[PDB]
A paper describes a structure:
Voltage-gated potassium channels (Kvs) conduct potassium ions in response to changes in membrane voltage. Kvs 10–12 have three intracellular domains: an N-terminal Per-ARNT-Sim domain (PAS), a C-terminal C-linker domain, and a C-terminal cyclic nucleotide binding homology domain (CNBHD). In addition to voltage-dependent gating, Eag1 is also gated by the calcium sensor calmodulin (CaM). CaM binds to Eag1 only in the presence of calcium and holds the pore closed even during membrane depolarization.
Therefore, we determined the Cryo-EM structure of Eag1 Δ3–13 in the presence of calcium and bound to CaM (Eag1 Δ3–13/CaM) (c and Figure 6—figure supplements 1, 2, 3 and 4). Two different conformations were identified for Eag1 Δ3–13/CaM: conformation 1 at 3.7 Å and conformation 2 at 4.0 Å resolution. In both conformations, the S4 helices adopt a depolarized conformation and intracellular domains are rotated in a counterclockwise direction when viewed from the extracellular side of the membrane, but in conformation two the extent of the rotation is larger (2.4° degrees for conformation 1 and 8.6° degrees for conformation 2). The rotation observed in these conformations is in a similar direction as the intracellular domains in the open conformation structure of hErg. However, the extent of the rotation of the Eag1 intracellular domains is not as large as the 20° rotation observed in hErg and the S6 helices remain closed. As a result, we believe that conformation 1 and conformation 2 represent pre-open conformations of Eag1 on the pathway from closed to fully open. Rotation of the intracellular domains observed in the different conformations of Eag1 Δ3–13/CaM occurs with CaM bound to the channel in the same orientation as observed in the WT structure. This finding suggests that binding of CaM does not clamp the PAS and CNBHD domains together to prevent rotation of the intracellular domains and channel opening as we previously proposed.
Numbering used by the authors:
A (entry chain C), B (entry chain A): 13 to 243, 247 to 304, 323 to 406, 412 to 696, 704 to 720
The structure:
């Protein structure tokens, strides 16, 4: 989803110059000029912009003012038109421009821009000079001006005569077909392929690829079973059905889109055809095709290579893939095993059984042995396939019972083959199970490693039982709350815009509730929220000590706090209360008067003095509003004088009961008088 | 454990306004006012706080002073009362407040706060104005004041008449029931559920979940054994016993607490019932329930899913879980194997044995074959279960001996099934063993990797044998001491309060023993200990070179040091000796006069000059005490002049033995005279 506005214009353009103006701003200021307009006008892009889209700076005394009034009327009524006006350049040469002005709509169908396309009718109108070396020189300057039409586009004209109307019609007809083609509408819309070209990540294409994965699995089950065991007519019916489906997939893989390394999407049918024909098309056509060649239908699962990169990333998905590959290879080498047994049981022209094959031993094991009439069969075909899959499963699972077990020469060659293949299939199943378990236990074991390091540290340094239980409680609580998420790292992945917007959403509990912040600009809100820090505190986990530096005013967005000065609660802070020190007015660091113990699990939103002062020095219009609207709930700097009632009572009891010292004492008293 | 003091008040309150005062501070200063009191009083929270809890700022000339004296008596005797007083607002409107004053106890049952709850009796007393637009306007202002009672709570009153006493009784009876309900006592107590609701992490509930895990294991062993092998009356007795226990678990899972993603605990019985009925209750009731349905008692181990998240994290615990799951699945598919053999041995109505099944081959193997009378049995039922568990264990362990080995059609279908299941069970056992070994060898192999990098570095850069052995000795010694604990990282996990308190405990060996630090404030102690660095040194591993910058005064908290100036020991530093340079008085960096070699394994506690100067500039009252009480044991800055006895002896021997040079020499001499 993008707004590919300019790219459409320069794609359809073929070297035509244009500028864009506003359709809602008075005098219609130029917002964009392409480089060809900078070459044609003789100006920079900086001096062209914020001039009028009617090119008022190119007007002159030779310009007809009624054409100017028609152009301004065209801008006033928002209609497509075209005009031919003598306008000036930066070197003031009279140039007969062909303008083609067109409004540009919105997604909401409101006109928002004026696209005006430019060309030159200098050679086709007349030469006029205020002063020149020659009439020939004025003609030469006119031919050097009118270049993009005559020298490039209208090249079949100047051999022929009477070409003025024809060249004007060609140059205007390019823009006239563009008047329906380039209506680019200035919308951030989704990029589209031409129709009859289906998308790669489409829902229909995804379920189509899933049902063709199911059908490749179907054919890989059934085709070796058919060619090995030599079996109705509904099976040929569904064979024709799945062949039709695979040829429909041939057509769909011809018509689909594609992802390359540089091109994230592919839109062109010749591009997808050239990408198709090298790799995929020849093996898929070799699959989609006398009976002995039917094994090449096993190349159908070559297109499961396309699902390869869909599900090669996920560990459980590649485990499910390898379990299916294990069972499929079991069926394949079961069919190979039956083919070997059926070869070996009647490899002799003398019709001898040789008394030794897995087929004959399976028959003699289960009953119904072989006998001749002819040569009457022994075991059932379904029982033979069941036992053959059983044998191949015993050899692939490395179980190896040995009921069905190889006993002749090519049987043991195949046994060596299946065991060396099944070793590696069993190993790769074990490897993906181990990889699944390590990638599913890594985030647990790193947490347990951090926790064991902390427990060993607090055991080693003889930290007391209360403080160590406190630290361990904090660590398990913040892990259970945060789910092991480094919030700084998750912010660092994002760019600066998303980082600021995420931080504004995190500190919305301050910025929507405080009257100091209800006047904040959007940029000031970003610049504040990038320096805010949300701080969670446990009950009894105090924030400021007595005498600690108060460098951070905190907004209690959740929970409750108490302010203990001299063992006495002085202020309870609730939801949406601001404490700390008034930094912008104090301009000095002070020690905290009082402890700030936390009553409940509380969420504060602190902000350091240096960061807040940076933001308030940069947003000078906001800083006065902050100073006028942020009343601190509790100044931690100011000392609150009081008396305890118990001490006042005891002093009243003592007042009811009741110069050599004064000379080293009144001195100090006078010092306090000077204080 | 928290002190949910305000939340209880605003939960029971239903929009009643209140302030809190101190019960031990004279004049009873307001420590908290809710937002409704800010709306009612017409003030901010900042101007209300530190005023008296009797609302002295709202007194006026129309206020009766004897009601004031009764209120101050109520504050003096610490008793619950209620009063109706005309008090002023910020816009000085006379308001008939209903106060309800109540003391608030402690966990130690001492009164510590005054909660006074507020309401309006403005409409119910009288209109009185100093000046007004109208008596009707004064009535309108009174109706706008008395809002929270009449417009909201007392809404059944104003249709009826004679409602004054009734509305006053209702508004005071809310607070009168609250006078027993909200006695919130201001204690950091544990949060409690209502009784007959049992805790999640409780010790009784944990051992209950463990015995029900044991019983689910019991039923998963016995129920397939029963339904497969078709077995007294004490077994039905213990069946009824365990069914009673499972229904007791139904009741307990109805009445327990619960943990959600947002809610860490759940206290409500309707909440736990609604959480129960979707997922757990329907499958547990399907479990806790003609004989052919007994297999659904295997759904009892669905509640072992609840222990899932108790022990899915620990690697050895999930290995023990998977070993038990392996053995349990062995027993299950052993029962399935016996059921298949018992089906296949008499699948014929002709009572033929077919000469081929694992049961018949096991009978013919071990003796006592099958014979008919009727059809007399072969092997013992216990021997059949033993051999069936043996077969299923051979197929799950991928051993596959082949005594007992499948030979018929559905037997080999089951064999393929058990081998494909046992492959993945064997793989996941192998994966958890590999994960256990990697997470138990990671902290060893990262240490060996660091040590190998160091040995390769000291081999590569041709560092000499003595220095390389020294570095390697340091590295293995600090690993054996620290157990591989990044002390900076373990501090960084903690918040600022716990970080400071841990650092104060780490530097307690300085802060309890030094007379310079016995005057330190608590905040100054935190601000010092966050910048202290404990430094361990090896014997012969010197700290300061000759001429090195002395930017850190060190406290030798353990071990002994020697100070070598010019190959001569000048001072031995023992436990609790401070050396370095007197930074606050010097205010310049100097070179060290002498080497400071370490005698034993010593622990110093250094602190850099810049950090110490920051702390002493911020704690100006502490800095003078530090300067007066910290005598440096050895000034490393000052040069100590002396003479060696051997050189004095040799010079005495030479003194007993004994202008063209002076002109380039006496000049220098005079320079030294100007020095």
């Amino acid at each position: 989803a993008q707004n590919t506005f300019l790219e459409n214009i320069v794609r359809r353009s073929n070297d035509t110059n244009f500028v864009l103006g506003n359709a809602q701003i008075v005098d219609w200021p130029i917002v964009y000029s392409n480089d060809g307009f900078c070459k044609l006008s003789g100006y920079h892009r900086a001096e062209v912009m914020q001039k009028s889209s009617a090119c008022s700076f190119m007007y002159g005394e030779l310009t007809d003012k009624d054409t100017v009034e028609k152009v301004r009327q065209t801008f006033e009524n928002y209609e497509m038109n075209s005009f031919e006006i003598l306008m000036y350049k930066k070197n003031r040469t009279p140039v007969w421009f062909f303008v083609k002005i067109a409004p540009i709509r919105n997604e909401q169908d409101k006109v928002v821009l004026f696209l005006c396309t430019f060309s030159d009718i200098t050679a086709f109108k007349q030469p006029i000079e205020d002063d020149s070396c020659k009439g020939w020189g004025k003609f030469a300057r006119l031919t050097r001006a009118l270049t993009s039409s005559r020298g490039v586009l209208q090249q079949l004209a100047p051999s022929v005569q009477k070409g003025e109307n024809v060249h004007k019609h060609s140059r205007l007809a390019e823009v006239l077909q563009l008047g329906s083609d380039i209506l680019p509408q200035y919308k951030q819309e989704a990029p589209k392929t031409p129709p009859h070209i289906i998308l790669h990540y489409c829902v229909f294409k995804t379920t189509w690829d899933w049902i063709i994965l199911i059908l490749t699995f179907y054919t890989a089950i059934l085709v070796p079973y058919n060619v090995s065991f030599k079996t109705n007519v509904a099976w040929l019916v569904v064979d024709s059905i799945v062949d039709v489906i695979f040829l429909v997939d041939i057509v769909l893989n011809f018509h689909t889109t594609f992802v390359g390394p540089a091109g994230e999407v592919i839109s062109d049918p010749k591009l997808i055809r050239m990408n198709y024909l090298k790799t995929w098309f020849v093996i898929d056509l070799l699959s989609c095709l006398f009976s002995s060649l039917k094994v090449v239908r096993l190349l159908r699962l070559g297109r499961v290579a396309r699902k390869l990169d869909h599900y090669i990333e996920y560990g459980a998905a590649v485990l499910v893939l390898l379990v299916c590959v294990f069972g499929l290879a079991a069926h394949w080498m079961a069919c190979i095993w039956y083919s070997i047994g059926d070869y070996e049981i009647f490899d002799e022209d003398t019709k001898t059984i040789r008394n030794n094959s897995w087929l004959y031993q399976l028959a003699l094991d289960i009953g119904t042995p072989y006998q001749f009439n002819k040569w009457e069969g022994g075991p059932s075909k379904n029982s033979v396939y069941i036992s053959s899959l059983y044998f191949t499963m015993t050899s692939l699972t490395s179980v190896g019972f040995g009921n069905i077990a190889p006993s002749t020469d090519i049987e043991k060659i195949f046994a060596v083959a299946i065991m060396m293949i099944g070793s590696l299939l069993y190993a790769t199943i074990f490897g993906n199970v181990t990889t699944i378990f390590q990638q599913m236990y890594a985030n647990t074991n790193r947490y347990h490693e951090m926790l064991n390091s902390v427990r060993d540290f607090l055991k080693l340094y003889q930290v007391p039982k209360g403080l160590s239980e406190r630290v361990m409680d904090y660590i398990v609580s913040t892990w259970s709350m945060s789910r092991g998420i480094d919030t700084e790292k998750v912010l660092q992945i994002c760019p600066k815009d998303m980082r600021a917007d995420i931080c504004v959403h995190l500190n919305r509990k301050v910025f929507k509730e405080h009257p100091a912040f209800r006047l904040a600009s959007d940029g000031c809100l970003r610049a504040l929220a990038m320096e805010f820090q949300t701080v969670h505190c446990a009950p009894g986990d105090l924030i400021y000590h007595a005498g600690e530096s108060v460098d951070s005013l905190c907004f209690v967005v959740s929970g409750s706090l108490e302010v203990i000065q001299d063992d006495e609660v002085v202020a309870i802070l609730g939801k949406g209360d601001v404490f700390g020190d008034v930094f912008w007015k104090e301009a000095t660091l002070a020690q905290s008067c009082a402890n700030v113990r936390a009553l409940t699990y509380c969420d504060l939103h602190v902000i350091k003095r240096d960061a807040l002062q940076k933001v308030l020095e940069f947003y000078t219009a906001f800083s006065h509003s902050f100073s006028r609207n942020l009343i601190l709930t509790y100044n931690l700097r100011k000392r609150i004088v009081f008396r305890k009632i118990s001490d006042v009572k005891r002093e009243e009891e003592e007042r009811m009961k009741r110069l050599p010292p004064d000379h080293p004492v009144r001195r100090l008293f006078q010092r306090f008088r000077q204080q």
